[PDB]
Ligand binder design. Structure first.
Ligand SMILES: */C=C\C(=O)N1CC[C@H](n2nc(C#Cc3cc(OC)cc(OC)c3)c3c(N)ncnc32)C1
Length: 279
């Protein structure tokens, strides 16, 4: 039973479901046409993406879907986060309607350009955009907890959009006290079972590595089983080849063992701004 939310509710007869978009990254998402969802163009049929439950969905899946939609209402609108457009919550299956990103997730996008070839400027721009996204998320008192290139969507205009809020939480001003991907987790998350914005900053470092390796798998050659021990010993990833010394030092800063010694997203945005405008 779902309470009605009139300002977000979209009519079912104005939604036409189409091609499935894949299953392993954001749950079951389907391409769709939504008539008059864009109020700037009230006549226009708009291409959208729709998240829904699969026939084999669990109670947790239903719970998570509702929760994720509510999260999207709380965080609000920002250029570098995926936009909620509407929802069908009454008299039928739960459909959550989000912005359509024609170029897929960042990991596949970058791997595919290992056919518009990535310049150095592009990789920095990509990095800036995501930092801006995270600066906003953190400013809304939201921790993401699953920041990876697989969870980033790319629009037609190559706009980076942070997505997948399945593990995202709204916290207070104090630390949030194993469903997180290990190779992306901060030590304090892995060992101490706490999460702050500075844990997201760690993850951002791993994302940075992903971007500059054009969609590489982190800690290459190293199984997840063995990463527990190596983190305790203070292992850090080597420098990517497409990466300047400057940008790798930013990477390494994000991978400081002491969370409060890592930069904030605000600082990351300022530094990347500088780097971007010079090159
Ligand atoms: C790992 C590959 C994979 O599964 N995909 C590649 C790109 C495909 N795709 N997913 C989305 C999405 C989404 C989405 C839905 C939400 O509903 C609550 C919430 C999100 O973050 C909060 C993200 C997608 C979109 N939106 N456009 C184009 N392709 C898309 C799946």
């Amino acid at each position: 039973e779902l309470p009605e939310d009139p300002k977000w509710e979209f009519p079912r007869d104005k939604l036409t479901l189409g091609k499935p978009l894949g299953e392993g990254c954001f749950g079951q998402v389907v391409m769709a046409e939504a008539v008059g969802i864009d109020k700037d163009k009230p006549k226009e049929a708009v291409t959208v993406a729709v998240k829904m439950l699969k026939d084999d969905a669990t109670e947790k899946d239903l719970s998570d879907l509702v929760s994720e939609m509510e999260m999207m209402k709380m965080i609000g609108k920002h250029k570098n986060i995926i936009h909620l457009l509407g929802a069908c919550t009454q008299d039928g299956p739960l459909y959550v309607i989000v912005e359509y990103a024609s170029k897929g997730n960042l990991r596949e996008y970058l791997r595919a350009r290992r056919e518009e070839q990535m310049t150095f400027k592009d990789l920095v721009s990509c990095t800036y955009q995501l930092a801006r996204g995270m600066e906003y998320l953190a400013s809304q008192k939201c921790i993401h907890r699953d920041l990876a290139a697989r969870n980033v969507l790319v629009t037609e205009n190559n706009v980076m959009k942070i997505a997948d809020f399945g593990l995202a939480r709204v916290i207070n001003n104090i630390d949030y006290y194993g469903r997180l991907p290990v190779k992306w987790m901060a030590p304090e998350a892995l060992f101490d079972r706490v999460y702050t914005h500075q844990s997201d900053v760690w993850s951002f470092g791993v994302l940075m590595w992903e971007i500059f390796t054009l969609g590489g798998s982190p800690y290459p050659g190293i199984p997840v089983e063995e990463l527990f021990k190596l983190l305790k010993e203070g292992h850090r990833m080597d420098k990517p080849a497409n990466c300047t010394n400057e940008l790798y030092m930013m990477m390494r800063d994000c991978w400081h063992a002491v969370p409060s010694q890592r930069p904030t997203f605000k600082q990351l945005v300022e530094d990347l701004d500088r780097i971007l405008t010079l090159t």
